[PDB]
Amino acid sequence: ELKIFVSSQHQPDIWRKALDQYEAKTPGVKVVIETGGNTSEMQAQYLNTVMSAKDSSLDVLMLDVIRPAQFATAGWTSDFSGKDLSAYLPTYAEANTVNGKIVALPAFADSMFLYYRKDLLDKYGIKPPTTWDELKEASKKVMEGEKNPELQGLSFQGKAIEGAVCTFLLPYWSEGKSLVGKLNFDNKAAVDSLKLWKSFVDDGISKKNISEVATDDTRKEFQAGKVLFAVNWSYAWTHFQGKESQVNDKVGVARLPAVKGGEQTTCLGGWEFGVSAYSKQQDEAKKLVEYLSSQDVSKFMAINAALLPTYAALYKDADVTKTIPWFADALPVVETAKARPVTPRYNEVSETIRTTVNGVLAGVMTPEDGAKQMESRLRRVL
Ligand SMILES: CO[C@H]1O[C@H](CS(=O)(=O)O)[C@@H](O)[C@H](O)[C@H]1O
């Protein structure tokens, strides 16, 4: 009788279909979904509480790509002994291996992309922007042409959530800088990043309360036809093309714009399945994770939920690209996407950066003071 922790955000109703396929072929085994918070840091704060207390209730954990160092060092997961991760993208083999131990099996890949209203860019003769400067010029042109009070130029995540860590790093990496064995905090790129996110609000290109916007708020608002440009993850696509959308067939996907004279870098994301060290069904949990991390299930979740695959071959799979054409071009974006710090203290890293991003955008602290505070707090942790 297995229990799997899955975010309300990760389309548990589509995972439920994959569990039904498992139960149909595996007699005597039933799985039940326990849904968690929409955002990764909320899920993490929850799982820390129950893993700390050695709660045996949960069997399989859907964990963020940022979680293996913590969960490995805490002893919260049962390692996949003699497991070979070489069927999967090297980036996810690397994320799920801590001190030589296979901590987890990849569930799905992810990276940030620029979603855009191809109907509005096409109306105004605009190319997908390759720089943030080009994105500001396109936004002002479209907003002034459309005279739609509800149309946002750019939605990005400014809420004090895990996605705001990603937000902070996008311009930092585009400028060619790295955060880390040791912290190498570049003040100029850190301030440039916080100033850039603030500039969209100050220019009216982003709404005044972007500090309140989480991943699925960007998703909901873009889907309701209210956003020209959206920073999001692959899952949003299935929602954009579903039965409750204002933007069916009106959505382009591009790589993120670069900073003035930078690269079109992005943030690595994605999720993996861990088996709780406290599960009393280790054997059946492991067999369930082997199924859910299999190629066929990787393919099903790409087609049915726009979850980017963990297997290189699936990005150009006939049925995958028939369903989502832009997956065919997505592999090199995923394989070159920059990783957030690997550390067991990642909760503290996240808390420092996301609270600094949110405070800058809420007008609590200047971009310069925000960077100053972040460097001091990260110094202590890394
Ligand atoms: C929904 O997952 C995606 O977004 C997360 C941010 S949040 O939406 O949870 O704040 C990232 O951490 C994940 O790596 C990425 O796959």
Pick left, alpha or beta for residue 176 (phi over 0 → left; psi -120 to 50 → alpha; otherwise beta).
left
Residues 270, 110: Cα–Cα separation, whole Å: 4
Closest residue CA from atom 5 of ligand 1: 163
Q: 328 and 341 share a domain? A: no
Tokens describing residue 117:
């209203």
Q: How many CB atoms lie within 10 A of CB 280?
A: 10
CA-CA-CA-CA torsion sign (21, 312, 76, 79)? positive
Q: How many domains does the chain divide into?
A: 2
Nearest CA to ligand 1 atom 14: 269
Chain centre distance of CA 256: 14
Amino acid at the residue 137: E
The resolution, in Å, is: 1.6
Residue 153 Cα to ligand 1 middle (Å): 22
- Determine the Cα–Cα distance for residues 139 and 162; give it in Å rounded to an integer: 26
One domain, residues 209 and 151: yes
Q: Name the residue among 126, 132, 117 with its Cα closest to residue 264.
A: 132
Indicate the angle between helix axes 187-202 and 132-146, nearest 10 degrees. 0
**Residue numbers preceding breaks in the chain (C to N > 2.5 A):** 180
- Atom 15 of ligand 1 has which residue's CA nearest to it? 269
Which atom in ligand 1 lies closest to the alpha carbon of residue 163?
10
Looking at the structure, tell me whether residues 198 and 283 fall in a common domain: no
- Let me know: does 162 contact 350? Beta carbons within 8 Å: yes
Query: Any idea what DSSP says for residue 212?
Result: G
Q: What is the DSSP letter of 330?
A: T
Written as six digits, the tokens of 338 are 């920059």
Atom of ligand 1 at shortest range from CA of 164:
10
What Cα–Cα distance (Å) separates residue 129 from each residue in 55, 95, 116, 291, 325?
Answer: 49, 31, 10, 40, 20
Instruction: Say if CB 371 and CB 190 are below 8 A apart.
Output: yes
**What phi-psi label fits residue 36: left (phi over 0), alpha (psi between -120 and 50 degrees) or beta?**
beta
How many angstroms is it from 24 CA to the middle of ligand 1?
31
Pair (216, 285) in one structural domain? no
292 Cβ partners below 8 Å, 6+ apart?
A: 15, 18, 22, 60, 105, 107, 273
- Please tell me whether residues 79 and 185 are part of one structural domain: no
What radius of gyration do the chain's Cα atoms show?
A: 20
CB 180 within 8 A of CB 234: no
| 222 shares its domain with 347 | yes
Cα(first)–Cα(last) distance of the chain, in Å?
A: 40
Which domain does 376 fall in, by range?
111-268+337-382
Looking at the fold, whether 364 and 260 belong to one and the same domain comes out as yes
Instruction: Give the number of residues written for the chain.
Output: 382
Cβ distance 382 to 178 under 8 Å? no
Tell me, yes or no, whether 125 and 239 share the same domain: yes
Among residues 120, 135, 136, 162, which one has the least CA distance to residue 271? 162
Whether residues 220 and 238 share a domain: the answer is yes
> Taking CA 311 as the corner, what is the angle to CA 309 and CA 313, rounded to the nearest 5 degrees?
105
Closest C-alpha among 72, 77, 96 to residue 5: 77
Contact in structure between 159 and 358 (CB atoms under 8 Å): yes
Do both 150 and 58 map to the same domain?
no
Given 299, 319, 336, which residue is the final one in a domain? 336
Six token digits for residue 240: 């954009």
Task: Provide the H-helix boundaries in the chain.
Answer: 12-25, 40-52, 68-74, 90-95, 118-124, 132-146, 162-174, 187-202, 215-223, 236-240, 282-292, 295-305, 318-323, 331-336, 346-362, 367-381
Last residue of a domain, one of 303, 318, 336: 336
Distance 271 CA to ligand 1 centre (A): 9
The β-bridge partners of 34 are: 5
Given a contact cutoff of 8 angstroms between Cβ atoms, the answer to whether 60 and 5 are in contact is yes
Instruction: Compute the distance from residue 39 Cα to the ligand 1 centre, in Å.
Output: 7
* Same domain (yes/no): 258, 377: yes
Do residues 67 and 216 share a domain? no
DSSP 339: P
